[PDB]
Design a protein around this ligand. Structure first.
Ligand SMILES: CCCCCCCCCCCCCCCCCC(=O)OC[C@H](COP(=O)([O-])OCC(O)COP(=O)([O-])OC[C@@H](COC(=O)CCCCCCCCCCCCCCCCC)OC(=O)CCCCCCCCCCCCCCCCC)OC(=O)CCCCCCCCCCCCCCCCC
Ligand SMILES: COC1=C(OC)C(=O)C(C/C=C(\C)CC/C=C(\C)CC/C=C(\C)CC/C=C(\C)CC/C=C(\C)CC/C=C(\C)CC/C=C(\C)CC/C=C(\C)CC/C=C(\C)CCC=C(C)C)=C(C)C1=O
Ligand SMILES: CCCCCCCCCCCCCCCCCC(=O)OC[C@H](COP(=O)([O-])OCC[N+](C)(C)C)OC(=O)CCCCCCCCCCCCCCCCC
Ligand SMILES: CCCCCCCCCCCCCCCCCC(=O)OC[C@H](COP(=O)([O-])OCC[N+](C)(C)C)OC(=O)CCCCCCCCCCCCCCCCC
Ligand SMILES: CCCCCCCCCCCCCCCCCC(=O)OC[C@H](COP(=O)([O-])OCC[N+](C)(C)C)OC(=O)CCCCCCCCCCCCCCCCC
Ligand SMILES: CCCCCCCCCCCCCCCCCC(=O)OC[C@H](COP(=O)([O-])OCC[N+](C)(C)C)OC(=O)CCCCCCCCCCCCCCCCC
Ligand SMILES: CCCCCCCCCCCCCCCCCC(=O)OC[C@H](COP(=O)([O-])OCC[N+](C)(C)C)OC(=O)CCCCCCCCCCCCCCCCC
Ligand SMILES: CCCCCCCCCCCCCCCCCC(=O)OC[C@H](COP(=O)([O-])OCC[N+](C)(C)C)OC(=O)CCCCCCCCCCCCCCCCC
Ligand SMILES: CCCCCCCCCCCCCCCCCC(=O)OC[C@H](COP(=O)(O)OCCN)OC(=O)CCCCCCCCCCCCCCCCC
Ligand SMILES: CCCCCCCCCCCCCCCCCC(=O)OC[C@H](COP(=O)(O)OCCN)OC(=O)CCCCCCCCCCCCCCCCC
Ligand code: SF4
Ligand code: SF4
Ligand code: SF4
Lengths: 97, 70, 318, 115, 379, 176, 156
């Protein structure tokens, strides 16, 4: 029965991203298909999530925007795209977004 | 997680299944839907050649039954 | 139609080798509390393709003072023989149905030692010649046991035909009456294919270099391809020999599915072992063969020559 | 013929993968490259590897053990004879002599790697 | 015979081989010689502190402690008790960092590659304790003559307790892979035997002494800081070989959890650097309101405190063995001479003797069992 | 106090001897080491998803340098050169002169980021919290010349990381 | 066709392979090498980006100079660099290999490995965090992705 529950989380992740297209978009951009709570969004398009069921280190992540200052960042993401005010939250230097 | 290793195994498993399936299917295609004849000893080869002379056509996998004896 | 059959053997073999590298890198990682390739393609399914293209558009550096003819011969012989050992395998129907299939496998396997010797001879390094003479000495030593263990099993099967091992094991696997041989056979295949803990030349990196450490680019990829094809081939041999599958002439696909599953579980046991044990010293793996395995294999060869006679269980010649 | 086709294809393909390996890429060679790897240092002598006697003994021992195996290969066929008492005696005689041969190299320090 | 050249820290072994055996082993060092002992003569005492994080770069805070004890001895001052308990706490978290590196790299050299990865997720968590007290994962520069730089942040001892409560199981998994493994015992038992009298005469220290049965540990014979207010046992070997020393290092990692368990419960309150503003800088909030505290902050960070003239050899039980500094002073703000006694320098000098009558594959096992880092051998 | 790691004598009763013979011939301890690597296969891996996840840091982290300002926009640095005197790697160069308004400010302020040992002594010595090490650790470059910062480069870092730098100082200045 | 289109797509393919299968050859020289090991440890797992843990000079594509380069060691480093098959990139890790670092003024230290070999990425720090080195490697992959080897050949 618990095994049957596993295959239901793996299905509701496809819906958690808005369907099959969104599921594939985040699979080919971030290599990860988890779904977490949305903490906020920044002026450049970055979206930040969290999931406290995950172990320390994987409990916060950012899905980078596809455009930033005129650069097509659909594939070319980079850790320096995180703005400072969110840079403190992502690196777990504070608990307050 | 550990099940993210299966997709690599599934691809590798299929690649090892194809050679055995293709050989099985190609043998039946070329021998009228039957197994290929195994002739490891001369007596088996003498019967295969005789089958080739009995079918009329030069195919040792064409079998003539009681209909051919009158 | 036969020429189509060859291409349905060679091409799927290489694809299996290319994706055995991914499976090895991910099974190793998860036993090490990490993931492995998951970026290049979904779950790293494109990682094998990236490596192959990378190696074949690199500079194929051949040393100036190297014997060019032998430098090229070694990788050709290694890969050529690797694919030749797949033609008689009954999966369940061989491409070439040999009456002496088992004996043909031994002969081609013993020829592969030349690729190791030519590679170390043609490089003019003497850092790679010592590794070659060490690898050559390890491979010839551990094929004495393979020839005797294989002979002992054929005394319950009755012939050299590989398709007959499917009939010997039509009621029961041979691993039950021959697990002493299976244990020594399994470790012998590790020592033949230079796998850990018997990998003193491929990647020892203990004040010792490999025999093909002078190769680069495409020529290196050919040594690697042959090495991994033989790994898969040796575990297919172990499945047919000791874990035989049942053959239904009307559903040959059932044999292939079950036969493939056992071959994968045996190939994943080469990755499992590499992650668990340290590597032997050179003298210690020589003492393992000459002082432990060979004395027991000779005793068990005497035992398996007289057991059929003393129980009235001699198999049929044909 | 089916066997000669299989061998020709196996070695023909392996040769194509070598020509495309030595011709497709873009080469650039000079003196420092195309030298023996060593370990980042210069060679310490213009002499080849000294001959080692112990490596020669393993090779010769394997050859003589290999030849004794050649006589053991037809045992599967030999168990079908009517002279089983004769056949079984010579089978064990050969394997025992192969053991006596090993028992000699062992007790004369032929299987040792310490100088 | 076959004179080969092995190597490319980085070592250059020039070994003479007669077959598999090793005839003479000649270590050529200096591939990582940087002139540290001459650069310290141009620095003040505070400016020379980061140089000691880079000698044995697996045991950073133990090297710092030895230098502070020497300067504190020539300064004739005493760090406060809370500083001392912090230094024992982080002196033993550092012993765990070194033994994991020393045991799993030793195993990595001889083919065992999996334990390296298990215990480097334990080093990674300990690096977060370094980062949370000093801001740097490796080269903290946190222990200074007079005490420590800053106090522990609130909520750090909880995470050291949570970590140390699971670390005994991690060792047990490591011992499952190695201790009873026949392949691992054949590589270590009766390899690199050293007699007690040879160990003493060759200048060995640490496990190289205790693997041979000598009962000597500076934490118990010449205690420093508060090592006489904590209880631990000293592992002792019997064979004197690589296997016994390997066990000695796995048992020390167990005795450090014992010591850490006590440093957490017995941590006292108070200041974390000596209340003497001519040696340790004042608090920043009094540097900005007191006239004297601005004068001393100015002088301590430009000229530095003056050490009275004298010379001292001060040694501690570093994870790799006795680590000491012979520090000469002429009365000024800069040391006149700083000889660094690196334990690996004496051990690597005994490689040739320990390798007598062994194969070439045992020389790798011998170098690992001495736990050689060429930051300190070459300085 | 001491303890013996390896001072044991195996028992020589036929029960124990047979146990060791079974171990030698049946590879029991080897097959017990396979179990430990099988269990790790079924544990969740410890890998984070970089660059979409970042390893935890702390307010005290020593990263890239930055010159700060007062809330009014005036520069905090008053060319005292304490940071230049204590830098153990001699990676700071400073020149100064009276400004047009008569204030004490710098004309040259260089940090050679390939000499710097990223030690923190410059932010300890500074009496006005002008030079700090922000939390940035992702500033690698394709040329050596790009890692030789001058005053213009350092003030841009301060004007770029002040939202985060000010917060980190707030969370740690009571420990200093 | 236009010819340019085919060359543009072939450039993408070969660039993709080269940046997706980087095999480094670590010259672990000093403390910076411990952080390089922590980039292979479970938390970061550079093997997942296609970066194998270790290789030999003949099968390596990128050299990571991580540590102080002494005068006694410089000739050894150059000979290993010359024997790497091309394309070959160099990553300089840490202050010691960048410009000499703490030992810049020493009599026995080479002031930056760039005096001996051409460098592609300079990773700052003493030592750089295992995340900084990972950021440096990913920056090198983008640099390979921008290469235009075949376009420039077509316009020769
Ligand atoms: C000229 C030219 O065109 O280049 C020739 C080419 C390279 O020579 P090169 O470019 O002139 O460079 C010479 C060096 O500069 C010369 O200096 P070097 O030190 O670099 O090389 C020395 C090399 C010189 O070799 C040669 O180049 C001979 C010309 O030494 C020799 O091999 C002497 C030639 C005798 C060959 C033995 C037959 O020689 C080869 O390596 C290719 C031929 C050898 C590979 C044979 C592959 C075909 C057979 C495979 C299919 C059959 C399966 C085999 C299974 C095993 C059964 C035996
Ligand atoms: C010296 O260091 C190293 C080793 O040695 C210890 C290694 O084994 C490996 C092992 C890992 C690899 C990924 C090496 C080779 C990669 C491949 C993808 C092999 C290529 C195989 C193929 C079957 C190519 C595809 C076949 C085609 C296109 C024919 C149809 C690496 C990387 C290494 O670096
Ligand atoms: C070309 C590259 C050469 C690579 C060397 C290895 C090639 C394999 C050798 C042939 C394998 C074999 O013996 O088959 C036995 C097999 C054993 O099969 P069998 O004994 O079970 O009998 C098969 C047929 N029944 C059972 C019905 C009797 O023989 C055959 O099946 C077919 C026999 C025809 C053989 C024709 C080969 C002629 C060319 C061979 C020499 C090749 C040149 C070698 C050059 C030097 C090599 C170093
Ligand atoms: C043992 C029990 C196997 C299950 C079974 O009974 O199968 C019955 C069935 C029996 O089918 P059968 O086709 O073999 O027929 C049996 C009857 N005789 C004997 C006449 C052939 O097997 C299967 O169909 C599926 C095979 C899967 C089991 C194979 C086990 C071998 C694994 C060896 C390697 C182990 C290492 C694993 C490493 C894992 C970690 C990476
Ligand atoms: C029998 C088939 C020919 C031998 C196959 C082995 C081989 O040629 O390896 C490449 C070998 C290795 O040579 P190479 O690697 O020393 O250099 C050849 C390419 N250049 C000179 C530009 C670096 O090529 C040759 O030696 C020449 C024979 C090649 C003939 C086929 C080439 C067709 C044109 C493309
Ligand atoms: C001799 C007469 C002139 C023939 C034309 C000629 O030499 O140039 C063809 C050229 C000359 O060879 P090349 O040595 O100048 O090429 C070196 C490597 N590239 C191609 C990157 C510049 O032959 C070729 O290699 C063309 C590509 C075919 C090889 C790769 C695919 C097949 C293997
Ligand atoms: C999906 C995965 C499903 C599980 C598949 C099976 C994996 C098996 C590996 C894990 C085994 C668990 C560990 C364990 O219990 O071993 C400890 C035990 C005990 O190890 P021990 O060394 O501690 O025992 C010492 C104590 N006395 C002396 C009392 C015995 O190991 C065994 O008992 C295994 C012995 C059987 C091995 C037979 C030889 C191999 C022959 C194979 C056929 C050829
Ligand atoms: C070995 C034999 C190989 C078979 C022969 C050669 C054919 C190989 C085909 C395989 C191509 C797969 C390309 C995969 C691209 C991809 O996955 O996305 C990467 C990238 C996207 O991923 P990314 O690399 O930008 O980053 C992903 C995001 N992160 C890193 C954050 C997770 O796509 C590209 O922009 C590059 C496109 C590659 C070029 C594709 C066109 C190829 C056309 C070939 C022409 C025919 C040649 C003859
Ligand atoms: C998902 C978790 C497990 C992870 C993967 C592990 C397993 C890896 C794969 C194991 C190997 C199997 C490879 C996949 C092949 C299975 C294909 C199949 O289902 O059977 C198809 C087969 C087609 O053959 P066909 O000749 O057309 O059928 C007779 C027609 N007269 O029709 C048949 O007849 C089959 C009987
Ligand atoms: C059967 C073995 C068990 C047995 O015989 O019973 C136990 C008995 C007690 O032995 P013990 O503990 O030594 O008590 C006497 C002390 N003076 O044992 C004895 O008293 C016998 C004392 C030992 C002498 C017999 C031992 C023979 C062992 C030879 C190996 C036998 C197996 C060979 C085949 C191996 C195949 C894998
Ligand atoms: S961090 Fe240390 S080395 Fe770097 S500039 Fe500041 S004082 Fe100098
Ligand atoms: S210590 Fe501060 S105020 Fe003085 S020169 Fe340096 S940055 Fe400016
Ligand atoms: S840059 Fe720093 S950490 Fe790296 S080798 Fe030099 S001193 Fe050590």
């Amino acid at each position: 029965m618990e095994l049957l529950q596993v295959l239901k989380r793996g299905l509701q992740q496809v819906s958690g991203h808005g369907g099959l297209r969104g599921y594939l978009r985040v699979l080919f951009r971030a290599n990860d298909v988890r779904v977490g709570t949305l903490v906020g969004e920044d002026k450049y398009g970055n979206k930040y999530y969290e999931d406290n069921k995950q172990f320390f280190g994987r409990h916060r992540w950012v899905i980078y925007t596809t455009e930033m200052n005129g650069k097509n960042t659909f594939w070319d993401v980079d850790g320096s795209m995180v703005p400072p005010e969110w840079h403190r939250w992502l690196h777990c230097m504070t608990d307050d977004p | 997680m550990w099940f993210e290793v299966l997709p690599g195994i599934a691809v590798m498993g299929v690649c090892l299944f194809i050679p055995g399936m293709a050989t099985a299917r190609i043998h039946r295609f070329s021998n009228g839907g039957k197994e290929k004849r195994v002739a490891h000893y001369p007596y088996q080869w003498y019967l295969m050649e005789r089958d080739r002379r009995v079918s009329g056509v030069n195919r040792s996998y064409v079998s003539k039954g009681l209909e051919n004896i009158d | 139609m036969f020429m189509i059959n060859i291409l349905m053997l060679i091409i799927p073999i290489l694809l299996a080798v290319a994706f055995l590298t991914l499976v090895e890198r991910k099974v190793l990682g998860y036993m090490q509390l990490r993931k492995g390739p998951n970026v290049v393609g979904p779950y790293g399914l494109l990682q094998p393709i990236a490596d192959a293209i990378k190696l074949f558009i690199k500079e194929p550096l051949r040393p100036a003072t190297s014997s060019a003819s032998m430098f090229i011969l070694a990788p050709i012989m290694a890969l050529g023989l690797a694919l030749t050992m797949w033609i008689p395998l009954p999966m369940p129907y061989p491409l070439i149905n040999m009456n002496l299939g088992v004996l043909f496998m031994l002969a081609m396997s013993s020829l592969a030692v030349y690729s190791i010797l030519w590679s170390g001879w043609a490089s003019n390094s003497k850092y790679a010649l010592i590794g070659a003479l060490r690898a050559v000495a390890q491979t010839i030593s551990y094929e004495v046991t393979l020839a005797i263990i294989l002979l002992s099993v054929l005394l319950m099967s009755g012939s050299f035909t590989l398709s007959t091992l499917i009939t010997t094991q039509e009621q029961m696997w041979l691993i039950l009456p021959a697990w002493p041989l299976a244990m020594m056979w399994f470790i012998s295949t590790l020592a033949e294919t230079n796998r850990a803990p018997f990998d003193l030349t491929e990647g020892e990196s203990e004040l010792v270099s490999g025999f093909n450490v002078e190769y680069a680019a495409g020529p290196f990829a050919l040594f690697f391809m042959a090495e991994y094809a033989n790994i898969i081939m040796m575990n297919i041999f172990t499945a047919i020999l000791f874990l035989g599958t049942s053959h239904n002439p009307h559903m040959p696909e059932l044999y292939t599915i079950n036969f493939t599953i056992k071959s994968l579980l045996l190939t994943m046991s080469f990755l499992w072992i590499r992650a668990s044990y340290p590597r032997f010293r050179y003298d210690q793996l020589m003492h393992l063969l000459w002082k432990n395995f060979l004395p027991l294999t000779l005793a068990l060869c005497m035992w398996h020559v007289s057991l059929p006679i003393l129980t009235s269980g001699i198999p049929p010649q044909t | 013929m089916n066997l000669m086709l299989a061998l020709l294809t196996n070695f023909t393909l392996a040769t194509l993968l070598v020509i495309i390996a030595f011709w497709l890429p873009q080469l650039n060679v000079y003196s420092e490259k195309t030298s023996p790897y060593e370990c980042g240092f210069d060679p310490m002598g213009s002499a080849r590897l000294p001959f080692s006697m112990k490596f020669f003994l393993v090779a010769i021992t394997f050859l003589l053990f290999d030849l004794e195996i050649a006589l053991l290969l037809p045992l599967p066929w030999a168990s079908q004879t009517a002279n089983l008492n004769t056949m079984l005696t010579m089978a064990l005689f050969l394997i025992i002599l192969l053991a006596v041969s090993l028992a000699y190299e062992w007790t004369q320090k032929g299987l040792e790697w310490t100088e | 015979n076959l004179t080969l050249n092995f190597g490319p820290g980085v070592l250059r072994l020039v070994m003479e081989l007669s077959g598999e055996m090793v005839r003479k082993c000649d270590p050529h060092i200096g591939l990582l010689h940087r002139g540290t002992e001459k650069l310290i003569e141009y620095k003040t005492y505070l400016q020379a502190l980061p140089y000691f994080d880079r000698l044995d770069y697996v045991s950073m805070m133990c090297n710092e402690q030895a230098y502070s004890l020497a300067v504190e001895k020539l300064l004739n001052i005493r760090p406060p008790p809370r500083a001392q308990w912090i230094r024992v706490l982080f002196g033993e978290i550092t012993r765990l960092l070194n033994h994991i590196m020393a045991v799993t790299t030793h195993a990595l050299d001889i083919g065992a590659m999996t334990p390296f990865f298990w215990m480097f997720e334990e080093r990674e968590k300990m690096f977060e304790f370094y980062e949370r007290v000093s801001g740097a994962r490796m080269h903290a520069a946190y222990v200074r003559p007079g005490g420590v730089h800053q106090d522990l942040p609130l909520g750090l001892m909880d995470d050291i307790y949570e970590f140390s409560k699971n670390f005994s199981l991690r060792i047990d998994e490591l011992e499952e892979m190695l201790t009873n493994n026949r392949i691992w015992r054949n590589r270590t038992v009766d390899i690199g035997i050293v007699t007690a009298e040879d160990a003493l005469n060759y200048g060995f220290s640490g496990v190289m002494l205790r693997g041979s049965g000598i009962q000597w540990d500076l934490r118990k014979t010449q205690p420093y800081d508060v090592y006489d207010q904590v209880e631990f046992d000293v592992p002792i070997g019997s064979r004197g070989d690589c296997y016994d020393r390997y066990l000695c290092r796995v048992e020390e990692m167990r005795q450090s959890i014992r010591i850490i368990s006590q440093c957490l419960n017995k941590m006292p309150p108070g200041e974390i650097k000596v209340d003497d503003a001519k040696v340790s800088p004042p608090k920043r909030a009094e540097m900005k309101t007191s006239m004297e505290s601005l004068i001393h902050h100015f002088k301590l960070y430009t000229e530095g405190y003056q050490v009275p003239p004298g010379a001292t050899y001060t040694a501690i039980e570093a994870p790799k063995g006795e680590f000491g500094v012979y520090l000469v002073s002429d009365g000024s703000s800069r040391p006149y001479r700083c000889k660094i006694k690196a334990p690996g320098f004496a051990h690597l000098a005994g490689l040739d003797k320990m390798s007598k009558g062994h194969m070439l594959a045992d020389v790798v096992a011998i170098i690992g069992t001495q736990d050689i880092v060429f930051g300190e051998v070459d300085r | 106090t001491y303890k013996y790691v390896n001072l044991r004598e195996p028992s020589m009763d036929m029960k124990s001897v047979t146990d060791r013979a079974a171990q030698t011939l049946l590879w029991t301890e080897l097959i017990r080491g396979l179990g430990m690597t099988l269990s790790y296969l079924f544990r969740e891996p410890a890998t984070i998803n970089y660059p979409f996840e970042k390893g935890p840091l702390s307010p005290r982290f020593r990263g890239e340098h930055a010159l700060r300002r007062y809330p009014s926009g005036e520069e905090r640095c008053i060319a005292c050169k304490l940071c230049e005197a204590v830098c153990p790697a001699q990676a700071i160069t400073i020149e100064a002169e009276p400004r047009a308004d008569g204030s004490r400010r710098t004309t040259r302020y260089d940090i050679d980021m390939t000499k710097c040992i990223y030690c923190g002594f410059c932010q300890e010595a500074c009496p006005v919290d002008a030079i700090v090490e922000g939390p940035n650790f992702e500033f690698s470059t394709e040329t050596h010349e790009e890692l030789l910062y001058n005053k213009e480069k350092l003030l841009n870092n301060g004007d770029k990381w002040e939202a985060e730098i000010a917060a980190n100082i707030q969370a740690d200045y009571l420990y200093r | 066709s236009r010819g340019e289109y085919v060359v543009a797509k072939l450039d993408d393919l070969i660039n993709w392979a080269r940046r997706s299968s980087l095999w480094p050859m670590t010259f672990g020289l000093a403390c910076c090498a411990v952080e390089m090991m922590h980039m292979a440890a479970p938390r970061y797992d550079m093997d997942r980006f296609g970066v194998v843990f270790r290789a030999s000079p003949r099968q390596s594509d990128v050299m990571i100079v991580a540590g102080t380069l002494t005068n006694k060691m410089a000739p050894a480093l150059r000979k290993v660099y010359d024997q790497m098959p091309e394309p070959r990139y160099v990553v300089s890790m840490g202050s010691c290999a960048n410009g000499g670092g703490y030992y810049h003024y020493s009599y026995s230290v080479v002031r930056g490995c760039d005096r001996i070999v051409p460098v592609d990425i300079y990773v700052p720090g003493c030592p750089p965090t295992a995340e900084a080195l990972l950021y440096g490697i990913l920056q090198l992959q983008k640099k390979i992705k921008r290469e235009k080897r075949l376009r420039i050949w077509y316009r020769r």
